[PDB]
Assembly symmetry: D2
Homo-oligomer: 443 residues x 4
C-alpha cells in the first residue's frame, strides 16, 4: 500500500530501467524527485520527505537555495558557457581566486577546475607525479575517490570498482585506514595510531621506496568508508613521514569539506596540517558539476597545458552557482551550525544507543554521522538486515536516508536543516529502531 503512494514513480522507473545502465545507480527506493527546497524533498506522486542524504553531501546549503537559483538564472542569460580551457570569464576568475585563498593553510595556492571530484583526484596524481618526479601513489583501503581510471584505482570501498575493468592505473599501493571501532581488546587511541602507522610503514620497509612515492592521498574522515575519522596522532605521523621523505601529502575534501564536519575543511579537525594538494567537489556548486584541485603554487606549476583540462570545467553558470554557495555558507554561518547541530545530533543518537543495543557505534563530526548497526557488541558482526529495515521504515515515514557498507546509517543532511525538521527525522529513526526490534518491519 506504500506502492499505491508511488504509482507514477514506479511506472517512470520501470521505463528508465530499459534505457539507463544499471551500473550507473546504487538502488534503494522508488524515489523520483519532482522538486525540493531546503531539506524537503517532493516526489512526482506528491509525497514529501526530509533529506538526510543531501545527495551524498552535495547539498550542504539545501535544495534550491534562493541565492543559488538566482545566480544560475542570471548567469545563464549572459553566458551559458565558454571554455576556460581557451579563454576567460569573470565568475571562474573570481571563484578560482577565492578557492585559492579559502583553502586550508597560508602557503600560496593555485587551482585547476574540473567537473567532478573524480577528475580532481586524477589531477592530484598528475601534479604529484610531475612535481616530485616520482611515480608511486599511496591511497587507503576503504577510500572513495571516484570513477575515472586514476581516482577509481585509488579507491577501495567497492569490489565492483575493480571487477572486469582492469588493468587499473599502475604504481598505486593501498594501505589500511585506522578503524577505531573494530579494534583489538584494550587498545587505546594511541595503540590504534601506532598499529596503523606500523602497517603504513610496512610497504615502505619492503618493496615501495619512500623516495619514489609521489603522494599519499587521504580522506581526513572517510565518507563512503563509513564515516571514520583517522586519529589525530596517526595523521600527524603520516604527515611527518611525508615531509621527511619528500612525499606530497594530499587530502580529499570532496565529501567532508565545505563545512560538513563543523569546520570549513575536514583537515581542520587536525592540528596545524596544510596539504600540498586537495580535491574539492560535491557541495562546491550546490550539485551543479564543478570540482577543483587546489595545491601549493609550486606543485601546481609543475605541468604545462594541456596536461589537465576539460571543456566544460569551470563552466560560468556552475561557477556562479559556487560563488553563491560559498556566500551562503559564510552568511548563514553553516560551518558553525554544522558543529552545533552535530553536537546535538550526536547526543541524540548516543541516547538512542542506550535504548537500542543494535547500535554498535555512533560516529559524528558535525552534521555528519555514521550509525553502525551490529548483531552483537562483542563480535561486532555487521547487521545489514537491521539497517535495511531501518531505512525502509524511515522512507515509508517521510525520511530519506541510506547506508554505507550495508550496516551503517549514513547521516548527512543539508547543513541548513531547521531544528524542527531535524527533530522530526530523529524521532522517525527512534521509532524505526523500536519498530525493527519488535520485528514489525518487513523488507
Amino acid at each position: 500500500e506504500l506502492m499505491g503512494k508511488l504509482d507514477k514513480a514506479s511506472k517512470l522507473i520501470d521505463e528508465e530501467n530499459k534505457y539507463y545502465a544499471r551500473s550507473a545507480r546504487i538502488n534503494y527506493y522508488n524515489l523520483v524527485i519532482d522538486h525540493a527546497h531546503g531539506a524537503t524533498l517532493v516526489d512526482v506522486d506528491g509525497n514529501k520527505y526530509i533529506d538526510l542524504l543531501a545527495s551524498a553531501s552535495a547539498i550542504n546549503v539545501g535544495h534550491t537555495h534562493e541565492k543559488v537559483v538566482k545566480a544560475i538564472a542570471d548567469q545563464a542569460q549572459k553566458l551559458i558557457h565558454y571554455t576556460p580551457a581557451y579563454f576567460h570569464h569573470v565568475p571562474g576568475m573570481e571563484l578560482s581566486e577565492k578557492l585559492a585563498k579559502i583553502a586550508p593553510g597560508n602557503s600560496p595556492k593555485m587551482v585547476s577546475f574540473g567537473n567532478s571530484g573524480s577528475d580532481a583526484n586524477d589531477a592530484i596524481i598528475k601534479f604529484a607525479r610531475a612535481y616530485t618526479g616520482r611515480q608511486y601513489i599511496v591511497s587507503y583501503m576503504g577510500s572513495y575517490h571516484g570513477s575515472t581510471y586514476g581516482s577509481q584505482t585509488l579507491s577501495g570501498s567497492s569490489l565492483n570498482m575493480t571487477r572486469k575493468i582492469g588493468p587499473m592505473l599502475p604504481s598505486v599501493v593501498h594501505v589500511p585506514y585506522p578503524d577505531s571501532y573494530r579494534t583489538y581488546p584494550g587498545e587505546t587511541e594511541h595503540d590504534v595510531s601506532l598499529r596503523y602507522f606500523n602497517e603504513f610503514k610496512k610497504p615502505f620497509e619492503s618493496f615501495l621506496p619512500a623516495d619514489e612515492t609521489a603522494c599519499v592521498l587521504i580522506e581526513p574522515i572517510q565518507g563512503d568508508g563509513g564515516i571514520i575519522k583517522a586519529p589525530e596522532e596517526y595523521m600527524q605521523l603520516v604527515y611527518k613521514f611525508c615531509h621527511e621523505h619528500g612525499i606530497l601529502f594530499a587530502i580529499d575534501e570532496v565529501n567532508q569539506g565545505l563545512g560538513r564536519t563543523g569546520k570549513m575543511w575536514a583537515i581542520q579537525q587536525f592540528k596545524d596540517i596544510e596539504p600540498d594538494l586537495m580535491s574539492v567537489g560535491k557541495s562546491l556548486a550546490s550539485g551543479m558539476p564543478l570540482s577543483a584541485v587546489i595545491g601549493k603554487k609550486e606543485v601546481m606549476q609543475s605541468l604545462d597545458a594541456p596536461a589537465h583540462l576539460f571543456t566544460t570545467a569551470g563552466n560560468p553558470v556552475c561557477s556562479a552557482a559556487s560563488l553563491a554557495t560559498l556566500d551562503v555558507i559564510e552568511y548563514e554561518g553553516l560551518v558553525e551550525k554544522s558543529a552545533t547541530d552535530g553536537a546535538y545530533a550526536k547526543q541524540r543518537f548516543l541516547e538512542m544507543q542506550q535504548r537500542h543495543p543494535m547500535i554498535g557505534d555512533v560516529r559524528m563530526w558535525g552534521l555528519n554521522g555514521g550509525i553502525e548497526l551490529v548483531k552483537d557488541p562483542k563480535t561486532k558482526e555487521p547487521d545489514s538486515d537491521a539497517a535495511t529495515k531501518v531505512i525502509y521504515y524511515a522512507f515509508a515515514h517521510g525520511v530519506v536516508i541510506i547506508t554505507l557498507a550495508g550496516n551503517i546509517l549514513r547521516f548527512q543532511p543539508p547543513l541548513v536543516i531547521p531544528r524542527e525538521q531535524l527533530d522530526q527525522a530523529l524521532q522517525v529513526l527512534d521509532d524505526a529502531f523500536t519498530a525493527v526490534e519488535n520485528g514489525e518491519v518487513t523488507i
Copy 2:
C-alpha cells in the same frame, strides 16, 4: 600596444590577476579574451568589444550562445531542483533524456545510456564497458586522437606530448595506431591506396604482439577533431569495422567533438555507410556547454557492469539534463543538421576560392560547418607554416573574429551552427584579409 591595452584594458588586468591563481596547465593560451556575455555567434568581452565566434567553445555551442530555449530550461529547472544525484535516485529530465539519447544514437539496435560530466569520463566508460563485456583487456586508439584528460581517456589520446610527460605510467594495455592522413601522401596514391596502406598499419600490431582475440575495443573519431579535422576514408573505416566484427572486438566511436550536427549529419559516423557502433561517447554540445556527457552502447554491452562500476555524483544533473533536452529540441526545430550541411558546402567553396589566391593554404578540409584550413610554407613540400597560422588568427582576433589553430598550422573552423550568413560572410572576409596581410608582411605578433 597602447591601442590593444586600450581595447583590452579591463581584460588584461583581470587576466593578470587570474594568472596568479589559476594553474597554467588548465588553459591553452591564444589571446586576452574575457567574455562577458554572448548570444548566437556573437561574443562580447568585458571591454565591450564584439566578436564573431568561429570556435563555438570547441564545438560545445552548436546551438549558439544563450539560446533562449536553453536559458529558460536552465532557469525553470533550477527553481525546481538544482540537483539530486541519479547515482542514488531519479528525476524526470534525466529519465527523459537518457531514453531519448538511446533512441537518437545511430543505428537500430537497442541501446542503453550512462551519464557523465565530460567527454573524458565517457571515454573512460568506453574502456570499462568494452573490457567488461568482452572479458579482454587491450584497447586500440589512434595517433592524433583526443579523448580527454582522465587517466583512461588521456592514455587513449595522441595529440599532445604534454598529455603524457611527467604523469605516467598511464593506463596499461593501450595500443596506438596511425590515423589515415589524406594530405601528406606518397606520390601517386589514390584514396584506395591510402585506405589500404593505413589498414595495413592497423593490422601490423595484430600480426605481431597484439592478439585480436584479446582486444576489447577499437576507439575512433570518425573525423579527428584536435588532430586537424581529418576524416578517415570510407574504405578504411569499412575495413576496420569489418575487422572488429570478425574478431569480436567492439567498434567504438567518439562523437564528442563531431556529433550533434557538426558534420551536416546528426553523427559523424553517418558520413560512412551503414555503420552502427557498439559504444559511443557524447559530450561538448550535448547540454550547450553545461557539463554533461554520455556513453551510449548496445544494450547487451551496457549490461556487462554492476553498480557502482561507473558513476559520478553530479553526472545527469537535472539542470544540465533540462539544458540538453532544450538543446536537442533546437537542433531539430531549427534544422541545424541541414544548415551545417548547406553552410558547410558554402564555406568549403569560399575557402577553395581563397586557396586560389592564397597558396599558403595547403589543404581545405570541410564536412559540414567544420573545417581545417591547413597552412604550409610550400605546396609541394607541404611543410607546416605555424608562424603564418599564428599571424592569421592574431589578425582575425584584432578584427573581431575568434578563431584558433590545431597542430600549430591548421585553422580550426567550427562556428555555432546557427551562425547567420551575414556574420559568416563577415568572418570569411576577415580571414581573406588576414591571408593578404600575412602575405604582405603586415602582421607582427608581439
Copy 3:
C-alpha cells in the same frame, strides 16, 4: 691494524683479482661481504686462490645442498658433456631432460598429477607461476608477500619484497600485483600467542579482498613456506591453513616458492611439507636443483600446466642436458645420502647448540631453525628487540677471518645454510667459531 694488514696479506691474490674485476663487472650484480675468490671446493670446504680454506655456512644461498664438487655430479656433468653439451628442448628432445621432467613431476609434494616446465633460474620459474596462474584462472591479480624474494626478472622482481633497490629506478613494475604482510612471530604485540599472530596476519591478508582487490579476480597467492631472504621466517601452521582454505574457497591458485627452502633444506623434501596436508597448485624449484648449474622448474597440477600454448614460456638453454644430468645426479645424492633426514637431525642439533649460545650471549634475540637452516637474529636488547646489524657484521667478519663463511639477512640476522652433507666435525668447528665470535664481539675485540 697490524692485524688487518696480516689478514689482508693472506688475501693478496684475491684482492688484486677483485680490484680488476670491479673495473668490468657491474656493482649491482653482487652484494659484497669479503674478498673471497674461490679456486676449488668440495663438500662443505672452500679453498681460495691464496690457499686459505673455509667451512661453508652459505652453500651459495642453498644452491649446494649436496656439497661442492660431489663426485656423482661431477661425473654426470663430464660424461654428458662428451655426448651433448646442448640441444634446446624448445624445439627437440633429450633423455636427461625427459627423465628429469618426469621425476620432478612425481617427487613434487602431493599425489595430484603434475607437469613441468624448465627454466634457468628461480626468477624465470616465478615469472612462469604468474603466467600459468593467469592463464588457467583467466584472472589477472597476483598476491605476494612483503619480505619475499622471488627473483630478478620483471615478474618475479615485482612480486618480491625484500629490497628497495629491487624497485628503485626501474619501474613501472608488472601491474596487478598486491603485496601482503608475512607473519612475523618474533616482533609481536605483548602477550600474543601463535594463534593471535595467525589471526592478526590473516586479518591483514583479508583487508585488500575486503577493499579493492576482488578474490574472484585473483589468479594466485605466491608464498614462501619459510621466507629465506626475509630472515628464515616460517609462517605459523594455522595462518598457512587459513590462506590455503581461502584460496580454495575463491578459486585462487595457491602457489609456493621452494627455490631456497626445497630439496631437503628444512629436513623435509619440501618446505611446504612442514605443514599439514597442503598440496600447491603451482611451485617453483631452483638453486640446489642442479648443484648450482643453471636450471629451474615450475611444477603445477596438470590442468594448470595445460592452460598455455607454445611459445608462451620457454628459454633456449633451459633444460640443458648437462644441467639435467647434474640435477638427476643431485637428486640421487639427496636420496642415497639420506640428506633430508640428515638436515632434520643436524638441524635439531644446531638449534640446541644455538639456544645454548643464546643463554650465554644475550645479543641473540631469536633462534629460528627448521632443518640445517637457520636465522640467528641479533638485537641490542632482548626486550626492545632493536636490530643490531653492527653486531651481526662483526660476527660474520670474525667468522671469515677464522675460516668460516657466513653472511647476513636483513642486516642483523645470521644466515645458517651449510651444505647438507657437512660433516659433524666441521659443523662443530663452525659452531665453536661462532660461539667465539659472540664472545669477541661482547668484549669489543672486533673492528669491522
Copy 4:
C-alpha cells in the same frame, strides 16, 4: 619407413608429453638427440642428421667441441658453482673482462651476467630506465627478446607470447621493423628506409615523448622475425635520433652475435655504431646457460645491488665453457668462415631460386639465412604449406631445418659445418624443392 626409423624416439616423446608442458616446446619432429659432434646429430634410434639449426644459433662452434668439453669437465672437478652474486671466481672474472673488451665500439664497458638472453633484455630495461630516469621503452614488431616478463613484453613475434598472461610490463611501445621484401611497387632501399623511419617517428609525434623514452632496443638483423636486416640508412637515422634525444640505443645480439653474420657482432654490419647497451646469449657458452648485458660504463653504474642478479648466473662451469667457445671462434677463424661460407650458400640458394620459383626471397648475411617461400613471385603470398613439406622432406633425408613465421626456411648451421656436409644439406634442400614442386611430399 619414416615412422619405422623413429620407434624409440616416438615412444620416448609420448611419455615425455605426459609430464613436460606443451607451452615449453614448438614441435616440428620426433627428434630425440643422443649425441652430437660438429654439425652431426645422432638420435636415440641411430639416425644421423646434418644440423642446419644449431639449436637456434646456440651452437656456433659445433656440438661437443673438444675444447669446450674439456673446459666443462676440468672446471666441474674444481668448482661446480659458487654464486657471483656474493663471491668471486676466476673463470667469471676473466670472462666479464673479456666481454667488456670484445663488445663493439671503443668506449669503456661493464658487464653483468645472467642465465638467458631473456634476463639480459630485462636488464637492458632496468639499466636504461635507471641511467636515463625515463620510463618508456621502444621495441619492434617482429622482434624476439625472450620469455621473462620484460623481454616478453618487448617481443613482437608471437601472439601466444601475449595471450592469457597480461597485463604486460607497462610503458612499452612497438614500432614496425623495416621489411625489404614486401615493399610498395618501385620502392628503393632509400624509400624503405625513409618510410620506416617515418613510422618510427609517428609515436614520438603523437603520444610518446622522446624526452621520456629510455631506450630503443633493436635486433640489427631480426632472427625469429625472418632473418630480416634493417637497411643501413634506417639504422643510422634511428641511431642519430636516439643520440639527439638522449635515448639509449640498445641492441640484441643474442641470436646474431658471436660470428653468426660473418662479423663478430651483427651491429658491425652497419657503419660506426656503438650501442649503449647490448644483450648476449645463446652461443656464448655453447648452449650452457649464460648471458650478459654489456653497456657503456656510466650506464652500468646507474644501479645498485641487488637490482639485477641471479644465483646461478655466471656459473663457473658455464663461464669456462664460454671462454673455450670464444677461443674456438678465434682459433678456427669462424667469423671469416661464416662470411665465406655464407657468400657461398647465398650463391647456391640464388641459383636454386632460378629453378625453383617458390623461392620468393633469399636473405643471407653470413651462414645465416631466411629462404622465404611464396605461392607466387608477384603477389608474395606466404606458402607455409610448401615450407612445411620442404622441412619434412629434409628431416626424412637426414637434414634438420625449421621455419620462421611459417614460410621462411631458417638456415643457421654451426659455423664449423664442414663443406661436404653443407653441400650435402644444400643438395637435400634442392631435391626437396623439386619433390614439393612434383607433389611428391605430404
